[PDB]
Amino acid sequence: NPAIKRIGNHITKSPEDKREYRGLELANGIKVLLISDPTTDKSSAALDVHIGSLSDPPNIAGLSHFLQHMLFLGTKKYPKENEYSQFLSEHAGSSNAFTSGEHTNYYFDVSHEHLEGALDRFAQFFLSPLFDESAKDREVNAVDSEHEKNVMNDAWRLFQLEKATGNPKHPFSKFGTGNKYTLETRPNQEGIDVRQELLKFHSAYYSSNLMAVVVLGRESLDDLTNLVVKLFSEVENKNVPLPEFPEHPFQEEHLKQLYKIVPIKDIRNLYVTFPIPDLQKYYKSNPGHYLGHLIGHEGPGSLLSELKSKGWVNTLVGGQKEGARGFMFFIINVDLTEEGLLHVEDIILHMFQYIQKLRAEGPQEWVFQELKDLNAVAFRFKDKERPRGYTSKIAGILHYYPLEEVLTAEYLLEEFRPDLIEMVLDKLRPENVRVAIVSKSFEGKTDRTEEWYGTQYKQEAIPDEVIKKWQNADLNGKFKLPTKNEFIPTNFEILPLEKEATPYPALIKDTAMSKLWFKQDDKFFLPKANLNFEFFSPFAYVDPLHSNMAYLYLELLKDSLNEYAYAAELAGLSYDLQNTIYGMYLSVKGYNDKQPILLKKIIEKMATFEIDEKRFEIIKEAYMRSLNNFRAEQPHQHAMYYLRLLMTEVAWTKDELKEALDDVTLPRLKAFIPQLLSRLHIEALLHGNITKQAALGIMQMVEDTLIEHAHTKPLLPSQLVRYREVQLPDRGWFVYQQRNEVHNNSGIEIYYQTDMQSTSENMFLELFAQIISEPAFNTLRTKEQLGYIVFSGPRRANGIQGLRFIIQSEKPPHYLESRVEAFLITMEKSIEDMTEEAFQKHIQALAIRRLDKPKKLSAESAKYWGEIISQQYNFDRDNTEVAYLKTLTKEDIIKFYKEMLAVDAPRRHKVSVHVLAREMINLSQAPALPQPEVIQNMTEFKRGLPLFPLVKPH
Ligand SMILES: [Zn+2]
């Protein structure tokens, strides 16, 4: 075969991985991985081009990102602007892409029966894209919103600020997103033909030698091979040299520098950065991760422990951070308490003290050995990935590793390299340090402005006196290396499937205190389990004050277990613990071996909790800011939030919570906890590598612990009250209007309430949503370009449902309203004009999506958990609902549109949330809308309306 340059030897995989693999290099240089999974419901492909933003023309920032957007909008073989989206949508698929500095990564999934058609359309992106003039003029606005959305976001600002403070000559300094100015206005002004620059760029850099492809399907490896050779060997090889960046963006003049930065949110952070060489080639020893593991440790003896005890920091991140081919960074990032903010010099001294400890002890093979063993176990028992993410991830790493090692390369450690460890450790020195402090206290004291985001900051030399103090850091006896991790699992035995084992969770305990749902894993056979618990107390959400206290309690509890639980975390045993409107939620996930130990500790801790006053005051202060910082969330997020407040029976606002927070004292909190625990109901799902007897024991152990230490008594069934959704009146339209003070975009959510969830009402809604899904995106974004964010689909809450539209835009909400209304009328015509085959395609597409099997335990657990917390308990829901779905007709959907959704629908139930921005033809005809009732007060609104029933259990 002349189209294939070489075929891969065995691709190393986990012995638990039933998927089949073959690696190839095509004659044109494309590295390929083929994955055969005859069980998969969705097939997938991805292609990664080893070119990105760092290669943008200096005079056209964002070109490669723009290019990425434009490949979706038509090729020579498939010139219809949305043929790709529409094909994927009509075949249960989805696509996306991303542009980073050195990569452009495209990926899709689709129903397994339609891989070839999806893959063919896809391949044309890399052969002959149209870069249509009309589409270019429109899509540039979507890139502009993407950017607009990021501008007042603290992370993006910091991201670009770093680039702005290094060598300006370095490609690292480039603005990667682009916007209307960089991609249209300035280029027109400078006489540039952007369509030619896209063609020029595609031609020069989209070369086969820089591409890697991954394809996953039901087909055999042989069949997948022919397929890929067929569609991809015509991609042209231009032998483009791979861009490299051997010169660090941070040279001498950029070291021993301090940056004082004003955030948008009220946050307090410190970023310590060291420039380091490119460690990528050392992947078999991974010295930077060895050091990140230690410097970032959260257990006893760690840097974070001492910083916490001193009341200076709460969280810490440490380790290596990617740059590009040629350079990397090493970082230590902490948040700051109000004291911490006054002690940055000391915090940083402690950092250099801990680093000095590492020099003193030298490289530790036992530490390396441990990281190795953990990674080995993690790889062996890796959860089976969803195809779309998997092809994308592997396509990226086909560029860095031999074909035979792509699956293992990022997991298995091979080499102990004390030499490389000392080499990197030698870079972590004060003379090589960069320091950034983010705090509102710098407000008004800054003299520089980063140009792309507007970030206010100040730059100073770190004084030599301060550098010297850091350089002479003695050994602090508070810092000890971590000890052996006792949570490392050793028992991976898969218990044989019991005789009375069930396909769905079975109710195996139904007492006044406990409802225990159980299922032994019959699918995945990895030594793991998920243990989920809902704790109900009417006292977790009875008022704002108690809602605050439930939160602080659990935050305090997690803060207190952190040192102990960290070992468990590294050993693949994690837990999740948060307060809810009904109670408390606890999830323990991971290797089942040491699980009961961690679970017992959490419950013991809950029931015998002693609060540290210093920890209390600090966490309370952070929570204060956290509530306040909601003002800086995105407009569309505000819209969703306000709607959730409006449609739920009981809901405390951020203002209400914040106001009540000043009244939370230590005495009150101490009194609250035993009250909260005094009466409970526990509903649990125990699912995985466990038996009925172990499950009964785990459950009973949780109860017995609560009973012994907290004297927990049962709740009454009548107390187990779920909240209802507000029942909107026939033909009603309500508008609630608010302003976002931070962002200069508007947000809108439109909710067309339909009826109670129900087999029939569920599938009417879901099928209509399926049909309008792609056209809504194509119409409201691609054509009309209202915003980057355009979403439509079902909304489900409290047993009720309806259709929702969410948009974030530069246009005012009342304008968005008419365009969404104009769009609905178009869909009605579209359903009338659509063929029977086209209609059945949509039924078939939704069917595939609903019946898509979970590939890992947690995904299956999640399905059940939904059935359980919604109190609907409909475990066979998918087969049932798909069967009903298949009997539906074009006529049925049209009747449902006319009765519930159309503008003059007799049972239209419409509520709109308008979030105004900070400073506030060729188009289809929008219908005239009625005068809306403007909601002035959320409480009056709820009082004046009925409440829906709750859904009856299955
Ligand atoms: Zn984008």
For ligand 1, the distance from its centroid to the CA atom of residue 250, given in whole angstroms, is: 28
For residue 69, report the distance from its CA to the centre of ligand 1, in Å.
Answer: 6
Q: What is the DSSP string of 31-99?
A: EEEEEE-TT-SEEEEEEEES--GGGS-TTSTTHHHHHHHHGGG-BSSS-STTHHHHHHHTTT-EEEEEE
Rounded Cα distance, 296 and 735, in Å: 49
Closest CA to 529 of 555, 495, 557, 506: 495
| Cα 158 to middle of ligand 1, angstroms | 19
C-alpha 46 – ligand 1 centre gap (Å):
17
Per-residue tokens: 719: 């107390």
**Backbone dihedral angles phi then psi of residue 866, each to the nearest 5 degrees:** -65, -45
CA of 139 to the centre of ligand 1 (A): 10
Domain of residue 906, residue span = 726-954
Q: DSSP for 132-189?
A: -HHHHHHHHHHHHHHHHHHHT-HHHHHHHHHHHTS-TTSGGG---S--HIIIIIHHHH
Distance 175 CA to ligand 1 centre (A): 13
Cα 104 to middle of ligand 1, angstroms: 11
CA of 63 to the centre of ligand 1 (A): 11
CA of 531 to the centre of ligand 1 (A): 38
CA 399–ligand 1 middle distance (angstroms): 23
CA–centroid distance, 621 to ligand 1, in Å, is: 36
How close is the Cα of 694 to the center of ligand 1, in Å? 49
- Residue 887 belongs to some domain of the structure: yes
CB contact at 8 A, 278 and 326: yes
Residue 690, beta-bridge partner list: none
Last residue of a domain, one of 242, 277, 305: 242
Structure tokens at 479: 């810092």
Task: Report which of 789, 796, 790 is spatially closest to residue 765, judged by C-alpha positions.
Answer: 796
The 104-111 sheet, strands edge to edge: 4-7, 20-26, 31-36, 211-217, 42-49, 104-111, 94-99
Residues 6 or more apart whose CB falls under 8 angstroms from that of 636 comprise 747, 748, 749, 789, 806, 807, 808, 915
CB 806 within 8 A of CB 817: no
- Cα 143 from Cα 153, distance rounded (Å): 16
Q: Coil, strand, or helix at residue 238?
A: coil
CA of 100 to the centre of ligand 1 (A): 10
SS (H, E, C) 342-365: CCHHHHHHHHHHHHHHHHHHCCCH
Q: What end-to-end distance do the CA atoms of the chain give, in Å?
A: 59
Q: How far apart are CA 299 and CA 484, in angstroms?
A: 11
407 alpha carbon – ligand 1 mean position (Å): 28
Q: What is the CATH number of the domain that holds 783?
A: 3.30.830.10
**CA 138 to ligand 1 centroid distance, Å:** 14
Same structural domain, 905 and 762:
yes
- Given a contact cutoff of 8 angstroms between Cβ atoms, the answer to whether 616 and 556 are in contact is yes
Dist. CA 359 → ligand 1 center (Å): 44
- Expressed in angstroms and rounded, the spacing between residue 140 Cα and the centre of ligand 1 is 10
**Rounded Cα gap, residues 37 and 144, in angstroms:** 40
Amino acid at the residue 33: L
Distance from the alpha carbon of residue 142 to the mean position of ligand 1, in angstroms: 8
Distance 409 CA to ligand 1 centre (A): 29
CA triplet 367, 370, 374: central angle to 5 degrees? Answer: 145
386 Cα to the center of ligand 1, angstroms: 23
Tell me how far the alpha carbon of residue 62 is from its chain's centroid.
Answer: 24
**Single-letter amino acid, residue 931:** Q
Q: What spacing in Å lies between the alpha carbon of 704 and ligand 1's midpoint?
A: 53
Which of the listed residues 242, 269, 285 is the one where a domain comes to its end? 242
Q: How was this structure determined?
A: X-ray
The rounded Å distance from CA 117 to ligand 1 centre is: 25
Are 398 and 360 in a shared domain? Answer: yes
C-alpha 107 to ligand 1 mean position (Å): 14
Rounded CA-CA distance 553/673 in Å is 7
State the distance from the centre of ligand 1 to the C-alpha of 789, rounded, in angstroms.
Answer: 11
Distance 630 CA to ligand 1 centre (A): 25
> Can you tell me the distance from the alpha carbon of 286 to that of 282, in angstroms, rounded to the nearest whole number?
6
Say if strands 20-26 and 104-111 run parallel, antiparallel, or are unpaired.
unpaired
Going from the Cα of 146 to the center of ligand 1, the distance in angstroms, rounded, reads: 6
In-domain check, residue 232: yes
* 480 falls within a domain: no
CB contact at 8 A, 505 and 517: yes
**Token pair belonging to 795:** 């909304």
The C-alpha atoms of residue 944 and residue 479 are separated, in whole angstroms, by 62
Q: Report how far ligand 1's centroid is from the alpha carbon of 44 (Å).
A: 21
Q: What's the Cα-to-Cα distance from 311 to each of 272, 470, 559, 723, 804, rounded to whole Å?
A: 19, 21, 13, 40, 45
Helices (runs of H) and strands (runs of E) counted in the chain: 31, 27
Q: Which residues pair with 142 in a beta bridge?
A: none
Q: Based on the fold, state whether residues 619 and 638 are members of the same structural domain.
A: yes
Residue 51 Cα to ligand 1 midpoint, Å, equals 15
Instruction: Output the CA 205–ligand 1 centroid distance in Å.
Output: 19
The string of DSSP letters for 820-848 reads HHHHHHHHHHHHHHS-HHHHHHHHHHHHH
Q: Are residues 230 and 267 in the same domain?
A: no
What is the distance in A from the centroid of ligand 1 to the CA of 432?
Answer: 35
Torsional sign, CA 82, 83, 89, 94 = negative
What's the full length of the chain, in residues? 954
Would you state the structure tokens that stand for residue 179, as one six-digit string?
């916007």
CA 179 – ligand 1 centroid, Å: 10
Q: Residue 778 class from Cβ within 10 Å (0-12 exposed, 13-18 middle, 19+ buried)?
A: middle
CA 260 to ligand 1 centroid distance, Å: 30
Ligand 1 centre and the CA of 817: distance in Å? Answer: 25
Q: Give residue 206's identity as a one-letter amino acid code.
A: Y
Place of tokens 């949780």: 702
How many domains would you assign to the chain?
4
H-state helical runs in 343-463: 344-361, 365-380, 387-397, 418-425
Burial (CB count <10 Å: 0-12, 13-18, 19+), residue 143: buried
CA of 185 to the centre of ligand 1 (A): 18
Rounded to the nearest angstrom, the distance between the alpha carbon of 605 and the centre of ligand 1 is 46
Q: How far is the CA of 176 from the centre of ligand 1 (A)?
A: 10
Ligand 1 centre distance from Cα of residue 56 (Å): 15
Residue 665 lies in a domain: yes
Q: Give 786 Cα–ligand 1 centroid separation in angstroms.
A: 15
CB 747 within 8 A of CB 637: yes
513 and 391 in a single domain? The answer is no
CA of 70 to the centre of ligand 1 (A): 10
618 and 514, same domain (yes or no):
yes
Residue 642 Cα to ligand 1 midpoint, Å, equals: 27
Longest dimension (CA), the chain: 81
Q: Which residue has the tokens 């975390």?
A: 569
Distance (Å) from CA 160 to ligand 1 centroid: 16
- How far is 773 from 834, CA to CA, in rounded Å? 15
Looking at the fold, whether 407 and 397 belong to one and the same domain comes out as: yes
Task: Order the strands of the 909-916 sheet from edge to edge.
Answer: 789-797, 800-809, 746-756, 909-916, 732-739, 933-934
CA of 764 to the centre of ligand 1 (A): 33
Which of 97, 102, 139, 131 is closest to 202 using CA atoms? 131
Q: Residue 80 falls within a domain, yes or no?
A: yes
User: What are the backbone dihedrals phi and psi of residue 143, each rounded to the nearest 5 degrees, phi first?
Assistant: -65, -40
The answer to whether 306 touches 478, Cβ cutoff 8 Å, is yes
- Tell how far the Cα of 65 is from the centroid of ligand 1, in angstroms: 6
Find the 251 Cα to ligand 1 centroid distance in Å. Answer: 31
Q: Please answer whether residues 458 and 399 qualify as being in contact, where contact means their C-beta atoms are separated by less than 8 angstroms.
A: no
Residue 483 lies in a domain: no
Give how far the C-alpha of residue 72 lies from the chain's centroid of Cα atoms, to the nearest Å. Answer: 23
C-alpha of residue 32 to centroid of ligand 1, in Å: 26
Q: Are residues 207 and 268 in the same domain?
A: no
Q: How far is the CA of 577 from the centre of ligand 1 (A)?
A: 34
Which residues pair with residue 911 across a beta bridge? 734, 751
d(CA 522, ligand 1 centre) in Å: 41
What is the CA(780)–ligand 1 centre distance, in A? 16
Distance of CA 395 from the midpoint of ligand 1 (Å): 19
- Give a yes or no: residue 8 inside a domain: yes
Do residue 748 and residue 708 come from a single domain? no
Report the distance separating Cα 604 and Cα 701, nearest Å: 10
- Cβ distance 674 to 710 under 8 Å? yes
Closest CA to 781 of 174, 317, 138: 138
Contacts for 297 with CB less than 8 Å, ≥ 6 apart? 303, 304, 482, 566
Instruction: For residue 275, list its beta bridge partners.
Output: 329
Q: Please indicate, yes or no, if residue 597 is contained in any of the structural domains.
A: yes
Measured distance CA(922)–CA(928) in Å, rounded? 18
Cα-to-centroid distance, 310 and ligand 1 (Å)? 43
Same-domain pairing of 210 and 265: no
The sign of the torsion formed by the CA atoms of 67, 68, 74, 80 equals negative
Find the 783 Cα to ligand 1 centroid distance in Å: 16
| 161 and 92 co-located in one domain | yes
Give residue for tokens 């993690």: 378
For residue 453, the CA-to-ligand 1 centroid distance in Å is 17
Cα 95 to ligand 1 centre (Å): 13
98 alpha carbon – ligand 1 mean position (Å): 7
User: What is the Å distance from ligand 1's center to 145 Cα?
Assistant: 9
73 CA to centre of ligand 1 in angstroms: 13
Distance 327 CA to ligand 1 centre (A): 25
Nearest to 553 by CA among 675, 403, 405: 675
**The domain boundary residue, chosen from 192, 207, 242:** 242
Answer yes or no: do 153 and 217 share one domain. yes
Q: Report phi then psi at 908, rounded to 5.
A: -75, 130
> What is the whole-number distance in angstroms between the Cα of residue 330 and the centre of ligand 1?
28
